[PDB]
Enzyme design. Structure first.
Site, PDB file in Angstrom:
ATOM      1  N   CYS A   1      -2.257  -0.740   7.229  1.00  0.00           N
ATOM      2  CA  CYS A   1      -1.435   0.461   7.162  1.00  0.00           C
ATOM      3  C   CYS A   1      -1.428   1.208   8.486  1.00  0.00           C
ATOM      4  O   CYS A   1      -0.399   1.767   8.878  1.00  0.00           O
ATOM      5  CB  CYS A   1      -1.932   1.367   6.045  1.00  0.00           C
ATOM      6  SG  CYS A   1      -1.385   0.811   4.432  1.00  0.00           S
TER       7      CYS A   1
ATOM      8  N   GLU B   1       0.936   3.744   2.132  1.00  0.00           N
ATOM      9  CA  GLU B   1       1.474   4.057   3.452  1.00  0.00           C
ATOM     10  C   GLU B   1       2.622   3.124   3.821  1.00  0.00           C
ATOM     11  O   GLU B   1       3.653   3.574   4.336  1.00  0.00           O
ATOM     12  CB  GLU B   1       0.355   3.986   4.492  1.00  0.00           C
ATOM     13  CG  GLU B   1      -0.726   5.052   4.313  1.00  0.00           C
ATOM     14  CD  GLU B   1      -1.802   4.658   3.311  1.00  0.00           C
ATOM     15  OE1 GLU B   1      -1.542   3.795   2.446  1.00  0.00           O
ATOM     16  OE2 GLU B   1      -2.914   5.220   3.385  1.00  0.00           O
TER      17      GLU B   1
ATOM     18  N   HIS C   1       0.834  -1.186   0.000  1.00  0.00           N
ATOM     19  CA  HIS C   1       0.000   0.000   0.000  1.00  0.00           C
ATOM     20  C   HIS C   1       0.880   1.252   0.000  1.00  0.00           C
ATOM     21  O   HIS C   1       2.093   1.195   0.220  1.00  0.00           O
ATOM     22  CB  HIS C   1      -0.929  -0.005   1.211  1.00  0.00           C
ATOM     23  CG  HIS C   1      -2.118  -0.904   1.066  1.00  0.00           C
ATOM     24  ND1 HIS C   1      -3.231  -0.799   1.873  1.00  0.00           N
ATOM     25  CD2 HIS C   1      -2.370  -1.921   0.207  1.00  0.00           C
ATOM     26  CE1 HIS C   1      -4.117  -1.713   1.518  1.00  0.00           C
ATOM     27  NE2 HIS C   1      -3.619  -2.407   0.510  1.00  0.00           N
TER      28      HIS C   1
HETATM   29  N1  LIG Z   1      -2.493   1.983  -0.966  1.00  0.00           N
HETATM   30  C1  LIG Z   1      -3.595   1.740  -0.003  1.00  0.00           C
HETATM   31  N2  LIG Z   1      -3.480   2.177   1.341  1.00  0.00           N
HETATM   32  C2  LIG Z   1      -4.546   1.932   2.265  1.00  0.00           C
HETATM   33  O1  LIG Z   1      -4.448   2.297   3.392  1.00  0.00           O
HETATM   34  N3  LIG Z   1      -5.757   1.236   1.823  1.00  0.00           N
HETATM   35  C3  LIG Z   1      -5.875   0.785   0.425  1.00  0.00           C
HETATM   36  C4  LIG Z   1      -4.846   1.013  -0.464  1.00  0.00           C
HETATM   37  N4  LIG Z   1      -5.205   0.489  -1.679  1.00  0.00           N
HETATM   38  C5  LIG Z   1      -6.452  -0.059  -1.551  1.00  0.00           C
HETATM   39  N5  LIG Z   1      -6.860   0.125  -0.246  1.00  0.00           N
HETATM   40  C6  LIG Z   1      -8.136  -0.317   0.311  1.00  0.00           C
HETATM   41  O2  LIG Z   1      -8.787   1.051   0.524  1.00  0.00           O
HETATM   42  C7  LIG Z   1      -9.807   0.798   1.322  1.00  0.00           C
HETATM   43  C8  LIG Z   1      -9.925   1.841   2.433  1.00  0.00           C
HETATM   44  O3  LIG Z   1      -8.651   2.154   2.902  1.00  0.00           O
HETATM   45  C9  LIG Z   1      -9.546  -0.677   1.980  1.00  0.00           C
HETATM   46  O4  LIG Z   1     -10.375  -1.604   1.333  1.00  0.00           O
HETATM   47  C10 LIG Z   1      -8.319  -0.958   1.725  1.00  0.00           C
HETATM   48  O5  LIG Z   1      -8.094  -2.400   1.655  1.00  0.00           O
HETATM   49 ZN   LIG Z   2      -3.427   0.147   3.674  1.00  0.00          ZN
END
Ligand SMILES: Nc1[nH]c(=O)nc2c1ncn2[C@@H]1O[C@H](CO)[C@@H](O)[C@H]1O
Ligand SMILES: [Zn+2]
Ligand SMILES: Nc1[nH]c(=O)nc2c1ncn2[C@@H]1O[C@H](CO)[C@@H](O)[C@H]1O
Ligand SMILES: [Zn+2]
Lengths: 157, 157
Positions: free
Chosen positions: B85, B54, B52
């Site tokens: 994250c 973060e 992700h």
């Molecule tokens: N790069 C990222 N960093 C993060 O924190 N969440 C990510 C994410 N890419 C997809 N997600 C999804 O976004 C939704 C709400 O956060 C959840 O379904 C997560 O699984």
């Molecule tokens: Zn995440």
């Protein structure tokens, strides 16, 4: 089959602390009795606080299988996965989690009081339907003893 | 400063979508108004569901500063960090989190209902203490617009 792979995870924890890669945590990822990844905590070796045993195993398994979901696979954790690692197990779509020691065994030797609400079913927003098995008896006792056995051999993080 | 770095995280989200690295998520880690890391989601690029925005930013900031704790640094997330994250942010010891869009904005365009209890103050076994700011006004508008602008420009995961 559960005892064998949980034991492999425990041995990974011991190996990782012995060579200084990180803390006493191991994780093994298996695809229908075939070991996809076998790793331990690499926080110290990688200078990466996200490089827990479970996250490392997920990264390695996903790279080996050339897909971002491990829905045909199961993960064996020497210790109860932390919130970050349980979130990673959720995102990886792993279908089963077997873990040996409770998080309190790691907390007893100074690790963060840092427990995944979704694993213990105590959350409002985050729920889980992942099949979770807490090991008992044999391998569970062996897994619990890891932290008393290794607490002199590494520095906390 | 807050709006500047939040906008940079949003720009990272757009960039990662445009180059096919992953989903519309960005993260910027700063140390006293100096950018330590600027990253977006790399799940598709790395074949790594843990990559992700973060987590990627935390790994890169920890590499940049040659240490596993970022207690002097703050993190700006384009979207509310997920449980994985937020757990990584906890383990990183980041002192402050500024996030733009509520997780519902990402859920509304196809991502999992996967929300961190500890971030929203409903955690029992996971209790954060880092300072958390949800963006308002123009920052919130930009961050929320990310998901309507990037609809059907990337592959869901
Ligand atoms: N790069 C990222 N960093 C993060 O924190 N969440 C990510 C994410 N890419 C997809 N997600 C999804 O976004 C939704 C709400 O956060 C959840 O379904 C997560 O699984
Ligand atoms: Zn995440
Ligand atoms: N490789 C690892 N995998 C994991 O899941 N957790 C790890 C870990 N290394 C240290 N921890 C900490 O152990 C305690 C109990 O879980 C928590 O404080 C955690 O932060
Ligand atoms: Zn963990």
């Amino acid at each position: 089959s559960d005892h064998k792979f949980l034991t492999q995870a425990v041995e990974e924890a011991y190996k990782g602390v012995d060579c200084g890669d990180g803390g006493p945590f191991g994780a093994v990822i298996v695809h229908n009795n075939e070991v996809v990844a076998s790793c331990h905590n690499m926080v110290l070796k990688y200078t990466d606080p996200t490089a827990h045993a479970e996250v490392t195993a997920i990264r390695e398994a996903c790279k080996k299988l050339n897909k971002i979901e491990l829905s045909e696979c199961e993960i064996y954790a020497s210790c109860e996965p932390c919130p970050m690692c349980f979130g990673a197990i959720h995102l990886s779509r792993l279908k089963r989690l077997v873990y040996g020691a409770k998080a309190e065994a790691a907390i007893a030797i100074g690790f963060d009081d840092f427990i995944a609400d979704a694993l213990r079913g105590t959350g409002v927003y985050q729920k889980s339907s992942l099949e979770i098995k807490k090991a008992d008896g044999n391998g569970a006792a062996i897994a619990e003893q890891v932290f008393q056995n290794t607490k002199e051999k590494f520095r906390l993080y």
